[PDB]
Write an enzyme that holds these catalytic residues in place. Structure first.
Site, short mmCIF file in Angstrom:
data_model
loop_
_atom_site.label_atom_id
_atom_site.label_comp_id
_atom_site.label_asym_id
_atom_site.label_seq_id
_atom_site.Cartn_x
_atom_site.Cartn_y
_atom_site.Cartn_z
NE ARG A 182 -27.96 75.40 -13.79
CZ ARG A 182 -28.99 74.84 -14.28
NH1 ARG A 182 -29.42 75.10 -15.68
NH2 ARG A 182 -29.31 73.66 -13.71
CG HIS A 204 -34.50 67.66 -7.15
ND1 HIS A 204 -34.59 66.17 -7.84
CD2 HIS A 204 -35.00 67.47 -5.95
CE1 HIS A 204 -35.11 65.50 -6.86
NE2 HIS A 204 -35.24 66.05 -5.78
CE1 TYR A 256 -24.09 51.09 -21.09
CE2 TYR A 256 -24.64 53.19 -21.66
CZ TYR A 256 -25.06 51.96 -21.49
OH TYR A 256 -26.27 51.47 -21.75
#
Lengths: 476, 481
Positions: free
Chosen positions: A20, A66, A110
Site C-alpha cells: 500500500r 481478499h 449506483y
C-alpha cells in the site's frame, strides 16, 4: 529465533510497503489500481458500450484478492474518478463523485463506470506474452505484477504517500511535454537539467496555482527534495463604489474552500479587520468565482499577505519524491524515470518482436507444407489409395517428402476445394509476404534505432489522438 | 533474494514491525485493555444500531460488513474474538448473545460460520454512547475517508475486572478477573477518600475471582500481586468425601479452576489408572451434567481417601498454580501499575469525559441561546423591523441595519428574517421566553458544575449504584488462608 523474528520483520515490512505504499518505477501504478485496470480490461466490454452500474466488477476484484476491505477498493475507484485530484483520466463514469469540496458519495454500486480511452492503448499487448504473471492465493487465475506502458504516468499523475517510513509528494506534469522529454532523451544521452527546464517548463495541476520559485524547482528535479510555493490566483478589480475587489480562481492543491473560508471568518471575528463582510464565493459550476471585496480604508494586498500567512492561499508544498524498484526505495532524479521507461519499452517491443516471429515462422512452416503439397498431388492421392490408415498415410508422406507431423496432418486436412491452382499462387504470394515480413523483423532485431523509431511511432499515434496544454498558469 | 543494503530503512521498518505487532494483538490499554478488533466489533455493532431490543441477526454478514468498512485483515482472529466475547463461561461478563453451536467447556470449539446468528448484551449501553460526545480522534481508511476511533472510553472500569490475554507478542502479561461489587465499593472509597491505604482496601477487596468458583488458599501471593502483579497462587477444586447407603466413600468435585478441561483430565485419570501410581480408585463416572456439573470418582474401602485427595492436589492438574502478570501500557509505552494507579487514570479519564460532554452540551445551549436571543430581540421592536424590510433591498442592507440597531451577528439576523406569521402568537412568544429561561437555568447549572469538581464524583457514584442495582454481583469463589 531473533534472527527469524528479524526475517519476519523484514518480510512483513516489505509486504506492507509493496502492498500500500509507493508503486514500482516501471509503472507508477499501485497494485490495487493495477488489478482494477487488469480486471476491467478482462471485463472485455468496450467503453463504446454504455458504462455499467454494478458492484459485480468489484466482486470479481475481491474474488481475485481478499483485502482488509473492499470499501477501500471502492475508495480506489472513486479516487481514480477524482479528476480534480488525479489528472486525466482513469474513469469513464457517471455517478456521484463530487469535487474538492468535502463530498461523500455513499452510493457505491449506483455509480457508473467502465474502461477509459487512455486505458485502451495504455494496456494493450497482453496477447503477446510481454509481461510475466503470478498465480493468486486462490490457485485458479493469474495476475501480472507490472504493466506495459505507453507513457510514464509517474510524471502524469503524482504521488501522495503515507509515512510507513515517510510519505512522498510527486507532482503531475503535461502529456506533450513528457513526449518531448522522451524524444529529447532518445535523441541525446547527454542532456542537462536546463534541457529538462526546456521540455518541462514546470509541473502542473488539474486545477492551477502559482509557483514563484526557481531554485526550489531546480533542487526538486536534481536532489529530489525541496518545497515550492502553491499560490491562489489573485485578480484586483475595481468596485463601482471604490473597493479593491479580489477575484480568486486558482488555489493551492488539496485545499478545500470550506474550512479555509471558515478560518477566514474566524480570523475576521477575533478582533481584526471586521469590515470585510464581503465574501461572494459561489457559482463555481462554471469555474471558480472566489470573490471577496476589501472594505474601505484598507488595501487588498495586506489582507492578501495575511491570508498567505494563513498558509491556505500560499502554501509551502514539499516533495519527498521517493520510489520503489528492485525491492528497494530510492531517492529520485531524472535519467532514472527516463532510462527506466526507455529500457522497459525496449523489453516490451523486443519481446513483442520475438512473439511475432514465433507466430510468423510457425505459419511459414505451415505454408511450406502447403506449397510442397500443392507441388505434386495425384501421386500422393494414388499412394493414399494404396493405404487404409492415417498412420500409414503419415508413413507414406514421410517416405514421399520432408514434412512435419503437423504438416502431414494439415495436408491430410484438404477437401476437394483445395485442388485448384489459383489458390496455389495465393498461398505462394502470402508465403513470400510472410518471408518478407520475417526478414523485416529479423533486420529490425539487428537495428537498435528502429526500436526507438517504433517508440516515436506510438508517441505520434497518441499525439495525433491527444494533446494537452498547461492549464496551470505558472509565473516565476 | 533480499539484497537490501540500506540498514537505516531496515531499522525503521523493524521498529514499525515491532510496534505494529504490539499494537495489533492484545494490549493492556488505558481505557479498555482490549484488542483493537474488539473496539471494531463494538463500534460497528453500535453504529449499525443492532440492539438486543430488536431480534437476532445473521452475524457473519455483519462480520463481512465491518471487515469491508475496515482494513482487509484476516478472518481468523476476527471470528475468534467473535466467539470469545460470546462465550459465557470464559469471560466473566456478557457481551455477545449468540444462538448457535459452540461447545461447552471441553475442547470442542464449534465453529459453525454458517450458523453465526447472534445479538449483543445490554452492557454496551453502559459502555459507550459517544454520538454527540466529542471524545476520541479518528483514523481514516479506504483512500483515507471513514472514521475509526482510537480508544474505547467508558464510565466504567469493567474491563479492568474482565481480564486480558496478551502474552506471546513481546513479553507476556494478562489481567486476572475480580467481581464488580466490592470493586465499586473500594473505588468509591478512593473517590471520597483520596488518601487511603492498600491493605484497608484489601479489607474491601476479596481475592481475584473466577467464573467457575475456585477454592483459594493463602494471602502472601495476594499481598505481592495486589502490589506488584507477579507471582503464582494455589487453587483447589470444591471436592468432598461423601458416604453411601453402604458406607463407601466418594470423591465428588463440583468445578475446577481456570483453564481446565473435563476430558483431558479424565484421560489423565485413566492414565493414572494404567500408570499404576495410584490405588483404591474404582469408578470414574460423570453424568447428568447439564442440570449441574457432577463428576464423581469412587474409591473402595481401606484406602485413606483424604490422602488420595492430597495426592490429587500434589500431582494432578486439579491443583492450579495460577500466575499473574499485569505489565501495563499507558499511551504506547509499556508500564506497570498498582491497583490504585489504574483507578487514578480511570478517575482523570472520567474527569475529561464529563468535562468534554458538558462543554458539548454548553455549546448546544449557547447556540440555541443565541437563536432565542435573536427571537426575543425580534420581538422587541417588531414594527420598526417591519418598516426596515419595507424600506431596504438586500441581505447586506438588512444585516447592516439590524447590526446597527441591535448589535447582532449575520446568522442571528437571518434567523430573525426566517420568522413566519404562525409563530407570532403571544402564547408561543412567551413559550420562547420560557424555554429561553429554561436553557439559561441549564447554562447556570452547568457553570455551577464547572465551579466544583466533586459533583462529577457524586453523579458517578450514583450511576455506579444504579449499575450495581441492575447488575447485582453475588460471589462464586472461596478464599481461605
Amino acid at each position: 529465533l531473533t534472527k527469524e523474528m528479524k526475517a519476519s520483520f523484514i518480510d512483513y515490512a516489505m509486504s506492507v510497503i509493496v502492498a500500500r505504499a509507493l508503486p514500482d518505477v516501471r509503472d507508477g501504478l499501485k497494485p490495487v489500481h493495477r488489478r482494477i485496470l487488469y480486471g476491467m480490461n478482462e471485463l472485455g466490454v468496450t467503453p463504446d458500450k454504455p458504462h455499467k452500474k454494478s458492484a459485480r466488477i468489484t466482486g470479481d476484484v475481491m474474488g481475485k484478492y481478499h483485502p482488509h476491505g473492499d470499501s477501500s477498493i471502492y475508495e480506489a475507484m472513486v479516487r481514480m474518478a477524482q479528476w480534480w485530484s488525479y489528472r486525466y483520466m482513469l474513469v469513464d463514469g457517471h455517478g456521484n463523485f463530487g469535487s474538492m469540496d468535502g463530498d461523500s458519495a455513499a452510493a457505491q454500486r449506483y455509480t457508473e463506470a467502465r474502461m477509459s480511452k487512455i486505458a485502451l492503448e495504455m494496456l494493450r499487448d497482453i496477447n503477446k506474452n510481454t509481461v510475466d504473471f503470478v498465480d493468486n492465493y486462490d490457485a485458479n487465475e493469474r495476475e501480472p505484477l507490472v504493466l506495459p506502458a505507453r507513457f510514464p504516468n509517474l510524471l502524469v499523475n503524482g504521488a501522495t504517500g503515507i509515512a510507513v517510513g515517510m510519505a512522498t509528494n510527486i507532482p503531475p506534469h503535461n502529456l506533450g511535454e513528457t513526449i518531448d522529454a522522451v524524444k529529447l532523451v532518445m535523441d541525446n544521452p547527454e542532456v542537462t537539467t536546463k534541457d529538462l527546464m526546456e521540455v518541462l517548463p514546470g509541473p502542473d495541476f488539474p486545477t492551477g496555482a502559482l509557483v514563484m520559485g526557481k531554485s526550489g524547482i531546480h533542487k526538486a528535479y536534481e536532489t529530489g527534495k525541496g518545497s515550492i510555493v502553491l499560490r491562489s490566483r489573485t485578480e484586483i478589480e475595481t468596485t463601482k463604489t471604490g473597493r479593491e475587489r479580489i477575484v480568486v480562481t486558482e488555489f493551492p492543491y488539496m485545499v478545500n474552500k470550506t474550512k479555509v473560508h471558515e478560518h477566514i471568518v474566524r480570523l475576521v471575528q477575533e478582533k481584526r479587520i471586521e469590515g470585510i463582510t464581503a465574501v461572494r464565493d459561489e457559482s463555481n459550476r462554471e469555474g471558480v468565482r472566489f470573490v471577496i471585496e476589501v472594505k474601505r480604508d484598507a488595501s487588498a494586498n495586506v489582507i492578501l499577505n495575511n491570508l498567505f500567512k494563513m498558509t491556505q492561499m500560499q502554501t509551502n508544498f514539499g516533495f519527498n519524491m521517493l520510489a520503489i524498484q528492485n525491492g528497494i526505495p530510492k531517492i529520485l532524479s531524472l535519467r532514472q524515470i527516463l532510462d527506466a521507461y526507455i529500457e522497459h519499452q525496449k523489453e516490451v517491443v523486443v519481446r513483442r518482436t520475438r512473439f511475432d516471429k514465433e507466430k510468423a515462422e510457425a505459419r511459414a512452416h505451415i505454408l511450406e507444407g502447403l506449397l510442397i503439397a500443392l507441388d505434386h498431388i495425384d501421386e500422393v492421392i494414388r499412394i493414399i489409395r494404396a493405404s487404409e490408415t492415417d498412420a500409414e498415410a503419415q508413413a507414406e508422406l514421410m517416405s514421399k517428402f520432408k514434412l512435419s507431423e503437423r504438416q502431414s496432418q494439415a495436408i491430410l486436412d484438404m477437401r476437394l476445394r483445395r485442388l485448384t491452382g489459383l489458390e496455389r499462387d495465393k498461398i505462394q504470394s502470402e508465403y513470400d509476404d510472410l518471408l518478407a515480413l520475417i526478414a523485416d523483423l529479423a533486420d529490425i532485431l539487428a537495428k537498435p534505432e528502429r526500436v526507438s523509431q517504433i517508440i516515436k511511432d506510438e508517441l505520434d499515434e497518441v499525439k495525433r489522438k491527444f494533446s494537452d496544454k498547461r492549464r496551470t498558469e505558472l509565473m516565476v
